[PDB]
């Protein structure tokens, strides 16, 4: 029923990839997850507008884009950084 995915922040690399819950009972909109994530992460501006994939290839827009067991990256007003986080 829920999703086991995780998020880091870009270009700085202290982050140990916290794994917040993603479920229908705890979330009802994709934009709601983009704002509930902001208290548990730090950015430059803090606008969590976008999130790129594990390799930063494509953008995300839906809950149904979330295959299990992958890491995403904090984005928005910035670009992808080619981070070797999971190494």
């Amino acid at each position: 029923r829920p999703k086991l995915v995780t998020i880091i922040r870009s270009g700085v690399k202290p982050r140990k990839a916290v794994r917040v819950l993603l479920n229908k009972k705890t979330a009802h909109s994709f934009e709601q997850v983009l704002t509930d994530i902001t208290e548990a992460i730090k950015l430059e501006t803090g606008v969590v507008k976008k999130l790129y994939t594990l390799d930063g290839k494509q953008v995300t827009c839906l809950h149904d884009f979330f295959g299990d067991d992958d890491v995403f990256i904090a984005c928005g007003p910035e670009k992808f950084r080619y981070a070797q986080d999971d190494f």
Binding site: R1, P2, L4, L21
Partner: peptide, 8 residues
């Protein structure tokens, strides 16, 4: 079970 399973 739908509270434990609801929390991963």
């Amino acid at each position: 079970l739908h509270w434990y399973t609801g929390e991963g």
